[PDB]
Amino acid sequence: ADVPAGVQLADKQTLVRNNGSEVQSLDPHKIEGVPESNVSRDLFEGLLISDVEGHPSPGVAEKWENKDFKVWTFHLRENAKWSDGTPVTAHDFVYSWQRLADPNTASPYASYLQYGHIANIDDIIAGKKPATDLGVKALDDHTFEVTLSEPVPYFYKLLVHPSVSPVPKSAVEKFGDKWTQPANIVTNGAYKLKNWVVNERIVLERNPQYWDNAKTVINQVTYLPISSEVTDVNRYRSGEIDMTYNNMPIELFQKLKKEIPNEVRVDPYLCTYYYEINNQKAPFNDVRVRTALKLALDRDIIVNKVKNQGDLPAYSYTPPYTDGAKLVEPEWFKWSQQKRNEEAKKLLAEAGFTADKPLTFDLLYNTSDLHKKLAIAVASIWKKNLGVNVNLENQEWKTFLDTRHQGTFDVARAGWCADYNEPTSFLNTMLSDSSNNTAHYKSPAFDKLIADTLKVADDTQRSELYAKAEQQLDKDSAIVPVYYYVNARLVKPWVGGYTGKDPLDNIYVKNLYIIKH
Numbered sequence: 001a002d003v004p005a006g007v008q009l010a011d012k013q014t015l016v017r018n019n020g021s022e023v024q025s026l027d028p029h030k031i032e033g034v035p036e037s038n039v040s041r042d043l044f045e046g047l048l049i050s051d052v053e054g055h056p057s058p059g060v061a062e063k064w065e066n067k068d069f070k071v072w073t074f075h076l077r078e079n080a081k082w083s084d085g086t087p088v089t090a091h092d093f094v095y096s097w098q099r100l101a102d103p104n105t106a107s108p109y110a111s112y113l114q115y116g117h118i119a120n121i122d123d124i125i126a127g128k129k130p131a132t133d134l135g136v137k138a139l140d141d142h143t144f145e146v147t148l149s150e151p152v153p154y155f156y157k158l159l160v161h162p163s164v165s166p167v168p169k170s171a172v173e174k175f176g177d178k179w180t181q182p183a184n185i186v187t188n189g190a191y192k193l194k195n196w197v198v199n200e201r202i203v204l205e206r207n208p209q210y211w212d213n214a215k216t217v218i219n220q221v222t223y224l225p226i227s228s229e230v231t232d233v234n235r236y237r238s239g240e241i242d243m244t245y246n247n248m249p250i251e252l253f254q255k256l257k258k259e260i261p262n263e264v265r266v267d268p269y270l271c272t273y274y275y276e277i278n279n280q281k282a283p284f285n286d287v288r289v290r291t292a293l294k295l296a297l298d299r300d301i302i303v304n305k306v307k308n309q310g311d312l313p314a315y316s317y318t319p320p321y322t323d324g325a326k327l328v329e330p331e332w333f334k335w336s337q338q339k340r341n342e343e344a345k346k347l348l349a350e351a352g353f354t355a356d357k358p359l360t361f362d363l364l365y366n367t368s369d370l371h372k373k374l375a376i377a378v379a380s381i382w383k384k385n386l387g388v389n390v391n392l393e394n395q396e397w398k399t400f401l402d403t404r405h406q407g408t409f410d411v412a413r414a415g416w417c418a419d420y421n422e423p424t425s426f427l428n429t430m431l432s433d434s435s436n437n438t439a440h441y442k443s444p445a446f447d448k449l450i451a452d453t454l455k456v457a458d459d460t461q462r463s464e465l466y467a468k469a470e471q472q473l474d475k476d477s478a479i480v481p482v483y484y485y486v487n488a489r490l491v492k493p494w495v496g497g498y499t500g501k502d503p504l505d506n507i508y509v510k511n512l513y514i515i516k517h
Contacts, residue, residue, distance in 0.1 A: 001217045001497050001513045008516040010494065012328055014302045015509060018232045019223040020245035022199045026180040029100050031409070032108040034417075039223050042191040042509045044165035044310070047074050047144070048156060052511075053268075054421045054502035056156055060166070060188070061144075062089055068474045069151035076142045081209040082168055083192045091188045092137035092166040095189065099172070100163060102131040109163035112419070113433065115428060117148045117454075153462065154324070157422040158504065165189075190216045190510035191258070199225055204509070205468050214367070217335060217513040236490050241313050243498075244490045245473050246505065248375065253309055253488075262493055266310045267500030268321050269487035271417035275378070275480040276343045277361075278409050280440040288351045289359065290343035290477035293411070296385040298337050303483050307375040310488070314481035316470045317416070318426040321484075325423050330474050348386065356396070360389035365413035366400040374482075375413060406436035414438070414479075421504055423466040424453065430473060441478040493517075 003009065021035045028044055031037060041049075049059035050083035060075035079138045080088040098236065100107050113121045119135030135147035147153065158164065168179070168186045175184040182193050190212065191204035202223045206216055224241065226232045229249040235241045246269075248256070257264045277284050277293065284290060299313035315333040318325050332340065353359040363379055365371040372394065379390035395403060404408050405461050416436075418425035432447050449469045456462045473479070491498050494517040498507075 001024065001215055003217065003496070003513050007513070010125075010514040010516045012512050013217055013219045013232065015218050015221040015243070015495070015512060015514065016241050016405075017221060017223050017243045017509075018241050018245035019202075019227050020225070020226050020232075020238070020247065022214075022225040023202060023223070026185070026193070026196075027177070027329045028096075028162050028167055029105050029107040029109070031162060034223075035475075037222075038507070039204070040162035040165065041189070041506060042221065043189045043193065044162065044167075044189040045080075045189040045210075046159055046162075046165035048159040049508065050421075050502055050504055050506040052162045052499050052501050054504045054506065056160055056357075056421075059160075060093075064156060066155075067334045069153040070148045070156065072146040072148070072155060073139075074144045074146075076144065077211060078142060079199070080188060081211065082186045082188045083207045083209050084186045085209050086170075086186075088188050089141040090144035091141065092119060092169060093144045094136050094138050094419060095169045095172075096166040097136050097164065098131040098134050099167065101125065101134050103127050103233055107163065109161070112161060112163050115424070116146075116158055117150045117152050119147045119149045122411060137164055151457075152454060153457060153459075154422045155423070157323075158420050160504075161419050177377065190508065193429065194220065196340075201412060212510065214516060216510045218415065218509050221509045233490065236492075242492045242495050246487050246489045247307065248488045248490075250307060250309070251369070256490065260490070263490050265491050265498065265500050266486050266488045267504050268312075268319070269417075269485040269505060270319055270322060270421065270503045271415055271485040272314055272317055272319055273311070273374075273485060274317065274414050274416075274480045275482065276404070276412045276414040276439045277477075277479055278407055278411070278440055279442070279478060280407060281410065282419045283353075283481075284361075284410060285360070286351050287477055288347040289353075290480075292347040292359075292386060293382070294344075294381060294477045294480045295332060295340040295347075296344040297480055298381050298385065299482055302374065302377060306373060307483075311483040312484040312486070314484050315474075316481060317430070317473055317479060318408070318423045318470055319484040319503070322418065322423050322426070323421040324459060324463050325470075327467055327470055328458070330471070337385070344386055348388075353388075358389050360391070362391045362393050362408035363411050363413070364393050364395065364400065364403065364409045365503075366397045367394045371413050383494065401438075407440055411480075412438075417485075418504060423463075423469075424450065427466065430486055439478050441473075443472065443474070443476060443478075446472045446476075 019035045023036045047061040048056040051057040062077040064074040120133045123129040172177040192207040193204035194205040232244040365375045432442040494515040497512040
Protein backbone atom coordinates (compact mmCIF):
# COMPACT_ATOMS: atom_id res chain seq x y z
CA ALA A 1 0.00 0.00 0.00
CA ASP A 2 1.34 3.60 -0.19
CA VAL A 3 0.37 5.31 3.09
CA PRO A 4 -0.03 9.09 2.66
CA ALA A 5 2.29 11.32 4.69
CA GLY A 6 0.28 12.43 7.70
CA VAL A 7 -2.17 9.48 7.91
CA GLN A 8 -2.18 7.78 11.34
CA LEU A 9 -2.52 3.96 11.12
CA ALA A 10 -4.85 2.07 13.45
CA ASP A 11 -2.99 -0.45 15.61
CA LYS A 12 -5.22 -3.31 14.46
CA GLN A 13 -4.64 -3.64 10.70
CA THR A 14 -7.47 -6.12 9.95
CA LEU A 15 -10.15 -6.02 7.32
CA VAL A 16 -13.47 -7.67 6.77
CA ARG A 17 -14.99 -7.99 3.33
CA ASN A 18 -18.19 -9.27 1.97
CA ASN A 19 -17.56 -11.61 -0.91
CA GLY A 20 -21.22 -12.16 -1.86
CA SER A 21 -21.08 -16.00 -1.97
CA GLU A 22 -19.11 -19.06 -0.87
CA VAL A 23 -15.99 -19.79 -2.84
CA GLN A 24 -15.94 -23.21 -4.41
CA SER A 25 -12.22 -23.42 -5.05
CA LEU A 26 -8.90 -21.71 -4.34
CA ASP A 27 -7.14 -23.46 -7.27
CA PRO A 28 -6.56 -20.82 -9.98
CA HIS A 29 -7.25 -23.45 -12.63
CA LYS A 30 -10.64 -24.21 -11.18
CA ILE A 31 -12.21 -20.87 -10.22
CA GLU A 32 -14.97 -19.38 -12.26
CA GLY A 33 -16.59 -16.18 -10.91
CA VAL A 34 -16.05 -12.89 -9.08
CA PRO A 35 -16.04 -14.15 -5.52
CA GLU A 36 -13.31 -16.67 -6.27
CA SER A 37 -11.25 -14.18 -8.21
CA ASN A 38 -11.42 -11.73 -5.33
CA VAL A 39 -9.71 -14.21 -2.99
CA SER A 40 -7.48 -15.50 -5.73
CA ARG A 41 -5.88 -12.02 -6.29
CA ASP A 42 -4.75 -11.84 -2.65
CA LEU A 43 -3.34 -15.36 -2.69
CA PHE A 44 -1.58 -15.73 -6.09
CA GLU A 45 0.12 -13.22 -8.36
CA GLY A 46 0.91 -13.79 -12.00
CA LEU A 47 3.14 -12.04 -14.49
CA LEU A 48 1.33 -8.69 -14.30
CA ILE A 49 -1.17 -7.05 -11.97
CA SER A 50 -3.72 -4.25 -12.40
CA ASP A 51 -2.61 -0.82 -11.14
CA VAL A 52 -4.94 1.87 -9.61
CA GLU A 53 -6.44 2.71 -12.99
CA GLY A 54 -6.83 -0.87 -14.04
CA HIS A 55 -3.79 -0.95 -16.32
CA PRO A 56 -1.34 -3.82 -16.35
CA SER A 57 1.77 -3.28 -14.24
CA PRO A 58 4.62 -5.40 -12.94
CA GLY A 59 3.73 -8.39 -10.80
CA VAL A 60 6.10 -11.35 -10.84
CA ALA A 61 7.46 -10.12 -14.16
CA GLU A 62 9.52 -7.00 -13.60
CA LYS A 63 9.80 -6.28 -17.31
CA TRP A 64 8.78 -7.84 -20.58
CA GLU A 65 9.17 -7.31 -24.30
CA ASN A 66 7.99 -8.77 -27.58
CA LYS A 67 9.28 -9.45 -31.05
CA ASP A 68 6.46 -8.73 -33.49
CA PHE A 69 3.78 -9.23 -30.81
CA LYS A 70 4.29 -12.93 -31.47
CA VAL A 71 7.14 -13.91 -29.13
CA TRP A 72 6.83 -12.49 -25.63
CA THR A 73 9.61 -12.53 -23.05
CA PHE A 74 9.01 -11.84 -19.36
CA HIS A 75 11.91 -11.15 -17.00
CA LEU A 76 10.94 -12.41 -13.55
CA ARG A 77 12.15 -10.58 -10.53
CA GLU A 78 14.68 -12.58 -8.52
CA ASN A 79 13.17 -12.06 -5.08
CA ALA A 80 9.67 -13.43 -5.88
CA LYS A 81 8.97 -16.32 -3.52
CA TRP A 82 6.32 -18.79 -2.54
CA SER A 83 5.23 -18.70 1.11
CA ASP A 84 7.42 -21.76 1.86
CA GLY A 85 10.32 -19.41 0.94
CA THR A 86 11.12 -21.19 -2.36
CA PRO A 87 11.62 -19.09 -5.53
CA VAL A 88 8.83 -18.42 -8.03
CA THR A 89 10.56 -19.43 -11.35
CA ALA A 90 9.63 -19.51 -15.02
CA HIS A 91 9.30 -23.23 -14.47
CA ASP A 92 6.31 -22.56 -12.29
CA PHE A 93 4.73 -20.70 -15.20
CA VAL A 94 5.59 -23.37 -17.74
CA TYR A 95 3.95 -25.99 -15.52
CA SER A 96 0.93 -23.87 -14.63
CA TRP A 97 -0.06 -22.85 -18.12
CA GLN A 98 0.33 -26.40 -19.28
CA ARG A 99 -1.92 -27.52 -16.49
CA LEU A 100 -4.43 -24.82 -17.43
CA ALA A 101 -4.46 -26.05 -21.04
CA ASP A 102 -4.73 -29.80 -20.41
CA PRO A 103 -8.28 -31.05 -21.12
CA ASN A 104 -7.96 -33.35 -18.10
CA THR A 105 -7.71 -30.32 -15.78
CA ALA A 106 -11.08 -29.21 -17.21
CA SER A 107 -10.46 -25.61 -16.26
CA PRO A 108 -13.37 -23.29 -16.78
CA TYR A 109 -10.72 -20.85 -18.17
CA ALA A 110 -8.78 -23.15 -20.48
CA SER A 111 -10.19 -21.05 -23.34
CA TYR A 112 -8.57 -17.96 -21.93
CA LEU A 113 -5.33 -19.12 -23.54
CA GLN A 114 -7.04 -19.40 -26.89
CA TYR A 115 -7.76 -15.67 -26.60
CA GLY A 116 -4.01 -15.27 -26.36
CA HIS A 117 -3.20 -17.50 -29.32
CA ILE A 118 -0.45 -19.47 -27.60
CA ALA A 119 1.08 -21.85 -30.14
CA ASN A 120 -0.65 -25.25 -30.18
CA ILE A 121 -3.34 -24.35 -27.74
CA ASP A 122 -6.20 -25.41 -30.14
CA ASP A 123 -4.53 -28.76 -30.75
CA ILE A 124 -4.01 -29.14 -27.01
CA ILE A 125 -7.59 -28.35 -26.07
CA ALA A 126 -8.88 -30.89 -28.68
CA GLY A 127 -6.61 -33.56 -27.21
CA LYS A 128 -4.48 -33.86 -30.38
CA LYS A 129 -1.18 -32.81 -28.84
CA PRO A 130 0.09 -33.29 -25.28
CA ALA A 131 0.04 -30.27 -23.06
CA THR A 132 3.81 -30.10 -23.11
CA ASP A 133 3.60 -28.80 -26.71
CA LEU A 134 2.16 -25.43 -25.58
CA GLY A 135 4.44 -22.64 -26.83
CA VAL A 136 5.69 -21.55 -23.40
CA LYS A 137 9.26 -22.06 -22.22
CA ALA A 138 11.66 -21.25 -19.45
CA LEU A 139 14.85 -19.75 -20.98
CA ASP A 140 16.30 -20.01 -17.47
CA ASP A 141 14.78 -19.70 -13.98
CA HIS A 142 13.91 -16.05 -14.39
CA THR A 143 12.98 -15.73 -18.02
CA PHE A 144 9.67 -16.94 -19.39
CA GLU A 145 8.91 -16.92 -23.10
CA VAL A 146 5.56 -17.27 -24.79
CA THR A 147 5.28 -17.94 -28.47
CA LEU A 148 2.02 -17.05 -30.20
CA SER A 149 0.62 -18.30 -33.46
CA GLU A 150 -0.57 -14.83 -34.53
CA PRO A 151 0.54 -11.38 -33.45
CA VAL A 152 -1.53 -10.39 -30.43
CA PRO A 153 -0.45 -6.83 -29.64
CA TYR A 154 -2.43 -6.62 -26.40
CA PHE A 155 -1.44 -10.09 -25.09
CA TYR A 156 0.12 -8.58 -21.95
CA LYS A 157 -3.29 -7.04 -21.10
CA LEU A 158 -4.63 -10.61 -20.50
CA LEU A 159 -2.02 -11.54 -17.82
CA VAL A 160 -3.68 -9.91 -14.85
CA HIS A 161 -6.47 -12.53 -14.70
CA PRO A 162 -6.30 -15.10 -11.93
CA SER A 163 -6.38 -18.12 -14.23
CA VAL A 164 -2.93 -17.38 -15.54
CA SER A 165 -1.32 -17.10 -12.10
CA PRO A 166 1.20 -19.86 -11.22
CA VAL A 167 0.39 -22.89 -9.11
CA PRO A 168 3.18 -24.49 -7.00
CA LYS A 169 4.18 -27.71 -8.89
CA SER A 170 5.52 -29.48 -5.76
CA ALA A 171 2.30 -29.07 -3.93
CA VAL A 172 0.26 -29.92 -7.06
CA GLU A 173 2.01 -33.19 -7.93
CA LYS A 174 2.22 -34.36 -4.32
CA PHE A 175 -1.22 -33.51 -2.90
CA GLY A 176 -3.13 -33.63 -6.16
CA ASP A 177 -6.39 -31.74 -5.37
CA LYS A 178 -5.69 -31.56 -1.70
CA TRP A 179 -3.06 -28.94 -2.45
CA THR A 180 -5.39 -26.07 -1.60
CA GLN A 181 -6.06 -27.37 1.90
CA PRO A 182 -4.70 -25.03 4.60
CA ALA A 183 -1.94 -27.52 5.39
CA ASN A 184 -0.68 -28.09 1.93
CA ILE A 185 -1.20 -24.81 0.19
CA VAL A 186 1.68 -22.55 -0.77
CA THR A 187 1.03 -19.18 -2.34
CA ASN A 188 3.01 -16.29 -3.83
CA GLY A 189 0.71 -13.34 -3.49
CA ALA A 190 0.65 -10.82 -0.69
CA TYR A 191 -1.46 -13.02 1.60
CA LYS A 192 -1.59 -16.66 2.61
CA LEU A 193 -4.40 -18.92 3.85
CA LYS A 194 -4.91 -18.95 7.63
CA ASN A 195 -8.39 -20.49 7.66
CA TRP A 196 -11.16 -21.75 5.47
CA VAL A 197 -14.49 -22.62 7.14
CA VAL A 198 -16.79 -23.38 4.19
CA ASN A 199 -19.87 -21.16 3.90
CA GLU A 200 -18.71 -19.17 6.90
CA ARG A 201 -15.43 -17.34 6.18
CA ILE A 202 -12.00 -17.41 4.57
CA VAL A 203 -9.25 -15.76 6.59
CA LEU A 204 -5.95 -14.71 4.99
CA GLU A 205 -2.87 -13.38 6.80
CA ARG A 206 0.13 -11.66 5.41
CA ASN A 207 2.68 -13.63 3.46
CA PRO A 208 6.10 -12.47 4.73
CA GLN A 209 7.84 -14.07 1.76
CA TYR A 210 5.93 -11.93 -0.74
CA TRP A 211 8.50 -9.87 -2.68
CA ASP A 212 6.66 -6.58 -1.88
CA ASN A 213 5.87 -7.46 1.68
CA ALA A 214 7.50 -4.28 3.13
CA LYS A 215 4.55 -2.36 1.64
CA THR A 216 1.79 -4.70 2.73
CA VAL A 217 0.02 -3.10 5.69
CA ILE A 218 -3.15 -5.12 6.42
CA ASN A 219 -2.15 -8.21 8.42
CA GLN A 220 -5.39 -10.12 8.06
CA VAL A 221 -8.40 -10.08 5.82
CA THR A 222 -11.60 -11.99 6.13
CA TYR A 223 -13.84 -12.63 3.22
CA LEU A 224 -17.38 -13.52 4.20
CA PRO A 225 -19.95 -15.24 2.01
CA ILE A 226 -23.12 -13.16 2.58
CA SER A 227 -25.33 -13.55 -0.45
CA SER A 228 -28.05 -11.20 0.81
CA GLU A 229 -27.54 -7.55 -0.09
CA VAL A 230 -29.71 -6.50 2.80
CA THR A 231 -27.77 -8.47 5.37
CA ASP A 232 -24.55 -7.19 3.88
CA VAL A 233 -25.68 -3.62 4.47
CA ASN A 234 -26.96 -4.41 7.93
CA ARG A 235 -23.80 -6.18 9.09
CA TYR A 236 -21.79 -3.38 7.62
CA ARG A 237 -23.95 -0.87 9.54
CA SER A 238 -23.44 -2.88 12.70
CA GLY A 239 -19.63 -2.43 12.27
CA GLU A 240 -18.76 -6.05 11.51
CA ILE A 241 -17.91 -5.49 7.81
CA ASP A 242 -15.65 -2.79 6.47
CA MET A 243 -16.42 -3.10 2.77
CA THR A 244 -19.61 -4.67 1.43
CA TYR A 245 -19.80 -6.73 -1.76
CA ASN A 246 -20.71 -4.74 -4.88
CA ASN A 247 -24.46 -5.40 -5.21
CA MET A 248 -26.51 -2.70 -3.51
CA PRO A 249 -30.22 -3.28 -2.77
CA ILE A 250 -32.23 -0.82 -4.91
CA GLU A 251 -34.59 0.25 -2.12
CA LEU A 252 -32.00 0.43 0.60
CA PHE A 253 -29.56 2.39 -1.53
CA GLN A 254 -31.61 5.54 -1.55
CA LYS A 255 -31.70 5.59 2.26
CA LEU A 256 -27.99 4.82 2.47
CA LYS A 257 -27.00 7.73 0.28
CA LYS A 258 -29.12 10.08 2.39
CA GLU A 259 -27.72 8.77 5.68
CA ILE A 260 -24.05 7.83 5.06
CA PRO A 261 -23.15 9.60 1.88
CA ASN A 262 -19.38 9.52 2.21
CA GLU A 263 -19.34 5.71 2.52
CA VAL A 264 -21.41 5.06 -0.65
CA ARG A 265 -18.75 4.50 -3.33
CA VAL A 266 -19.97 4.47 -6.89
CA ASP A 267 -17.56 4.17 -9.81
CA PRO A 268 -17.66 3.03 -13.43
CA TYR A 269 -17.39 -0.73 -13.89
CA LEU A 270 -16.52 -2.83 -16.99
CA CYS A 271 -19.85 -4.64 -17.25
CA THR A 272 -22.74 -3.95 -19.60
CA TYR A 273 -26.36 -4.78 -18.86
CA TYR A 274 -28.27 -5.70 -22.03
CA TYR A 275 -31.21 -7.72 -23.39
CA GLU A 276 -29.92 -10.37 -25.70
CA ILE A 277 -32.05 -11.09 -28.70
CA ASN A 278 -32.11 -14.55 -30.16
CA ASN A 279 -30.89 -13.59 -33.66
CA GLN A 280 -31.78 -16.92 -35.30
CA LYS A 281 -35.42 -17.06 -34.20
CA ALA A 282 -38.14 -15.54 -36.34
CA PRO A 283 -39.26 -12.97 -36.21
CA PHE A 284 -36.15 -11.69 -34.38
CA ASN A 285 -34.11 -12.70 -37.36
CA ASP A 286 -35.53 -9.64 -39.11
CA VAL A 287 -33.24 -6.65 -38.37
CA ARG A 288 -36.25 -4.26 -38.45
CA VAL A 289 -37.84 -5.99 -35.40
CA ARG A 290 -34.57 -6.09 -33.50
CA THR A 291 -34.10 -2.36 -34.15
CA ALA A 292 -37.57 -1.56 -33.00
CA LEU A 293 -36.95 -3.12 -29.60
CA LYS A 294 -33.57 -1.29 -29.37
CA LEU A 295 -35.11 2.08 -30.15
CA ALA A 296 -38.28 1.99 -28.05
CA LEU A 297 -36.69 0.90 -24.74
CA ASP A 298 -36.37 4.20 -22.76
CA ARG A 299 -32.97 3.80 -20.92
CA ASP A 300 -33.51 6.95 -18.93
CA ILE A 301 -36.40 5.61 -16.97
CA ILE A 302 -34.66 2.38 -16.26
CA VAL A 303 -31.47 3.97 -15.06
CA ASN A 304 -32.89 7.11 -13.44
CA LYS A 305 -36.24 5.99 -12.02
CA VAL A 306 -36.20 2.21 -11.66
CA LYS A 307 -32.60 1.64 -10.64
CA ASN A 308 -31.45 5.13 -9.72
CA GLN A 309 -27.85 4.23 -8.75
CA GLY A 310 -25.71 6.15 -11.24
CA ASP A 311 -25.62 3.52 -14.04
CA LEU A 312 -25.01 5.08 -17.51
CA PRO A 313 -27.47 4.53 -20.35
CA ALA A 314 -25.68 2.45 -22.94
CA TYR A 315 -25.60 2.68 -26.69
CA SER A 316 -23.04 -0.07 -27.34
CA TYR A 317 -21.85 -3.41 -25.88
CA THR A 318 -18.28 -2.52 -24.94
CA PRO A 319 -18.33 0.20 -22.28
CA PRO A 320 -16.85 3.47 -23.62
CA TYR A 321 -14.37 3.78 -20.72
CA THR A 322 -12.85 0.45 -21.62
CA ASP A 323 -9.11 1.06 -22.15
CA GLY A 324 -8.51 1.15 -25.93
CA ALA A 325 -12.14 1.91 -26.91
CA LYS A 326 -12.90 5.13 -28.94
CA LEU A 327 -16.61 4.58 -29.67
CA VAL A 328 -19.04 6.82 -31.51
CA GLU A 329 -22.50 7.48 -30.19
CA PRO A 330 -24.90 6.48 -32.96
CA GLU A 331 -27.41 8.97 -34.30
CA TRP A 332 -30.43 7.12 -32.89
CA PHE A 333 -29.17 7.69 -29.34
CA LYS A 334 -29.47 11.43 -29.69
CA TRP A 335 -33.07 11.34 -30.96
CA SER A 336 -35.94 12.04 -28.59
CA GLN A 337 -37.88 9.08 -27.18
CA GLN A 338 -40.92 10.05 -29.28
CA LYS A 339 -38.98 10.01 -32.54
CA ARG A 340 -37.47 6.71 -31.48
CA ASN A 341 -40.96 5.35 -30.72
CA GLU A 342 -42.45 6.59 -33.95
CA GLU A 343 -39.64 4.97 -35.96
CA ALA A 344 -39.76 1.71 -34.02
CA LYS A 345 -43.53 1.45 -34.66
CA LYS A 346 -43.05 2.02 -38.40
CA LEU A 347 -40.34 -0.63 -38.49
CA LEU A 348 -42.65 -3.14 -36.79
CA ALA A 349 -45.58 -2.29 -39.17
CA GLU A 350 -43.30 -2.96 -42.16
CA ALA A 351 -42.59 -6.42 -40.78
CA GLY A 352 -46.37 -7.09 -40.35
CA PHE A 353 -47.04 -6.24 -36.68
CA THR A 354 -49.37 -3.53 -35.55
CA ALA A 355 -51.63 -2.50 -32.65
CA ASP A 356 -54.24 -4.85 -34.08
CA LYS A 357 -51.77 -7.76 -34.65
CA PRO A 358 -48.99 -7.25 -32.13
CA LEU A 359 -45.56 -8.72 -31.72
CA THR A 360 -45.75 -10.94 -28.70
CA PHE A 361 -42.71 -12.72 -27.28
CA ASP A 362 -41.18 -13.96 -24.06
CA LEU A 363 -38.66 -12.14 -21.91
CA LEU A 364 -36.52 -14.66 -20.11
CA TYR A 365 -34.54 -13.59 -16.94
CA ASN A 366 -32.68 -15.55 -14.20
CA THR A 367 -34.62 -15.60 -10.93
CA SER A 368 -33.69 -12.57 -8.78
CA ASP A 369 -35.17 -9.27 -7.54
CA LEU A 370 -33.01 -6.90 -9.53
CA HIS A 371 -33.70 -8.63 -12.86
CA LYS A 372 -37.41 -9.07 -12.19
CA LYS A 373 -37.84 -5.44 -11.30
CA LEU A 374 -35.95 -4.57 -14.53
CA ALA A 375 -37.92 -7.06 -16.60
CA ILE A 376 -41.22 -5.70 -15.30
CA ALA A 377 -40.25 -2.07 -16.00
CA VAL A 378 -39.02 -3.09 -19.43
CA ALA A 379 -42.02 -5.24 -20.34
CA SER A 380 -44.17 -2.25 -19.45
CA ILE A 381 -42.06 0.35 -21.36
CA TRP A 382 -42.23 -1.84 -24.48
CA LYS A 383 -46.00 -2.43 -24.17
CA LYS A 384 -46.66 1.33 -23.99
CA ASN A 385 -44.06 2.72 -26.54
CA LEU A 386 -44.47 -0.04 -29.14
CA GLY A 387 -47.72 -1.88 -28.48
CA VAL A 388 -46.06 -5.31 -28.10
CA ASN A 389 -47.08 -8.06 -25.72
CA VAL A 390 -44.31 -9.26 -23.52
CA ASN A 391 -44.60 -12.33 -21.24
CA LEU A 392 -42.13 -12.58 -18.32
CA GLU A 393 -40.57 -16.02 -17.65
CA ASN A 394 -37.92 -16.68 -14.99
CA GLN A 395 -35.55 -19.64 -14.81
CA GLU A 396 -32.89 -20.61 -12.30
CA TRP A 397 -29.39 -19.70 -13.23
CA LYS A 398 -28.28 -23.04 -14.70
CA THR A 399 -31.47 -23.63 -16.63
CA PHE A 400 -31.36 -20.03 -17.81
CA LEU A 401 -27.85 -20.40 -19.21
CA ASP A 402 -28.54 -23.66 -20.85
CA THR A 403 -31.71 -22.21 -22.43
CA ARG A 404 -29.67 -19.31 -23.87
CA HIS A 405 -27.04 -21.67 -25.34
CA GLN A 406 -29.67 -23.95 -26.72
CA GLY A 407 -31.35 -20.99 -28.47
CA THR A 408 -34.84 -21.67 -27.17
CA PHE A 409 -35.72 -18.11 -26.15
CA ASP A 410 -36.90 -14.94 -27.79
CA VAL A 411 -35.33 -12.23 -25.73
CA ALA A 412 -33.15 -12.68 -22.68
CA ARG A 413 -31.76 -10.64 -19.81
CA ALA A 414 -27.98 -10.65 -19.92
CA GLY A 415 -24.80 -9.12 -18.48
CA TRP A 416 -21.15 -9.41 -19.55
CA CYS A 417 -18.15 -8.12 -17.51
CA ALA A 418 -14.60 -7.84 -18.94
CA ASP A 419 -11.90 -10.26 -17.64
CA TYR A 420 -9.26 -7.84 -18.82
CA ASN A 421 -9.30 -4.18 -19.83
CA GLU A 422 -9.31 -4.26 -23.66
CA PRO A 423 -12.36 -4.31 -26.00
CA THR A 424 -11.88 -7.89 -27.26
CA SER A 425 -12.91 -8.96 -23.76
CA PHE A 426 -16.43 -7.95 -24.83
CA LEU A 427 -16.14 -8.31 -28.64
CA ASN A 428 -14.85 -11.91 -28.77
CA THR A 429 -18.21 -13.05 -27.38
CA MET A 430 -19.99 -11.99 -30.63
CA LEU A 431 -17.53 -13.74 -32.98
CA SER A 432 -19.71 -16.15 -34.95
CA ASP A 433 -17.97 -19.31 -33.66
CA SER A 434 -17.51 -18.02 -30.15
CA SER A 435 -18.52 -20.11 -27.23
CA ASN A 436 -20.04 -17.18 -25.47
CA ASN A 437 -22.27 -16.20 -28.42
CA THR A 438 -25.73 -16.81 -26.94
CA ALA A 439 -27.19 -14.03 -29.13
CA HIS A 440 -26.59 -16.46 -32.06
CA TYR A 441 -25.22 -13.55 -33.95
CA LYS A 442 -23.49 -14.74 -37.07
CA SER A 443 -21.80 -11.95 -38.97
CA PRO A 444 -18.84 -12.29 -41.32
CA ALA A 445 -18.39 -8.59 -41.58
CA PHE A 446 -18.03 -8.45 -37.74
CA ASP A 447 -15.74 -11.47 -37.63
CA LYS A 448 -13.44 -9.92 -40.25
CA LEU A 449 -13.07 -6.56 -38.44
CA ILE A 450 -12.07 -8.42 -35.28
CA ALA A 451 -9.61 -10.58 -37.12
CA ASP A 452 -8.11 -7.39 -38.58
CA THR A 453 -7.34 -6.06 -35.09
CA LEU A 454 -4.69 -8.77 -34.73
CA LYS A 455 -2.82 -7.44 -37.78
CA VAL A 456 -2.81 -3.77 -36.77
CA ALA A 457 0.17 -2.60 -34.72
CA ASP A 458 -0.93 0.92 -33.73
CA ASP A 459 -3.25 1.10 -30.73
CA THR A 460 -5.26 4.00 -32.20
CA GLN A 461 -5.84 2.21 -35.48
CA ARG A 462 -6.73 -0.88 -33.45
CA SER A 463 -9.17 1.25 -31.50
CA GLU A 464 -10.65 2.47 -34.79
CA LEU A 465 -11.47 -1.08 -35.90
CA TYR A 466 -13.09 -1.77 -32.49
CA ALA A 467 -15.35 1.26 -33.05
CA LYS A 468 -16.34 -0.14 -36.40
CA ALA A 469 -17.02 -3.53 -34.87
CA GLU A 470 -19.34 -1.78 -32.36
CA GLN A 471 -20.99 0.15 -35.17
CA GLN A 472 -21.51 -3.08 -37.05
CA LEU A 473 -23.19 -4.70 -33.97
CA ASP A 474 -25.37 -1.59 -33.61
CA LYS A 475 -26.42 -1.62 -37.25
CA ASP A 476 -27.38 -5.29 -36.94
CA SER A 477 -29.13 -4.42 -33.68
CA ALA A 478 -27.81 -7.75 -32.40
CA ILE A 479 -28.62 -6.82 -28.83
CA VAL A 480 -30.43 -4.18 -26.88
CA PRO A 481 -27.95 -2.33 -24.62
CA VAL A 482 -29.39 -0.84 -21.46
CA TYR A 483 -26.65 0.44 -19.24
CA TYR A 484 -23.02 0.37 -18.24
CA TYR A 485 -22.72 -0.70 -14.66
CA VAL A 486 -21.43 1.38 -11.86
CA ASN A 487 -19.49 -0.46 -9.10
CA ALA A 488 -21.31 0.59 -5.96
CA ARG A 489 -20.36 -0.52 -2.44
CA LEU A 490 -20.18 0.70 1.11
CA VAL A 491 -16.63 1.37 2.26
CA LYS A 492 -15.83 2.44 5.85
CA PRO A 493 -14.18 5.89 5.91
CA TRP A 494 -11.11 4.38 7.72
CA VAL A 495 -10.44 2.05 4.79
CA GLY A 496 -7.62 3.92 3.10
CA GLY A 497 -6.29 3.24 -0.29
CA TYR A 498 -9.65 2.70 -2.05
CA THR A 499 -9.70 4.91 -5.18
CA GLY A 500 -12.60 3.39 -7.19
CA LYS A 501 -10.44 4.08 -10.33
CA ASP A 502 -9.98 0.48 -11.64
CA PRO A 503 -12.97 -0.29 -13.83
CA LEU A 504 -12.27 -4.02 -13.50
CA ASP A 505 -12.57 -3.71 -9.73
CA ASN A 506 -9.36 -5.77 -9.28
CA ILE A 507 -8.80 -4.81 -5.64
CA TYR A 508 -5.64 -6.13 -3.98
CA VAL A 509 -5.78 -6.04 -0.14
CA LYS A 510 -2.02 -5.42 -0.15
CA ASN A 511 -2.86 -1.88 -1.35
CA LEU A 512 -5.34 -0.94 1.42
CA TYR A 513 -4.54 0.23 5.02
CA ILE A 514 -6.69 0.99 8.10
CA ILE A 515 -6.75 4.61 9.21
CA LYS A 516 -6.75 5.21 12.95
CA HIS A 517 -10.29 5.77 14.07
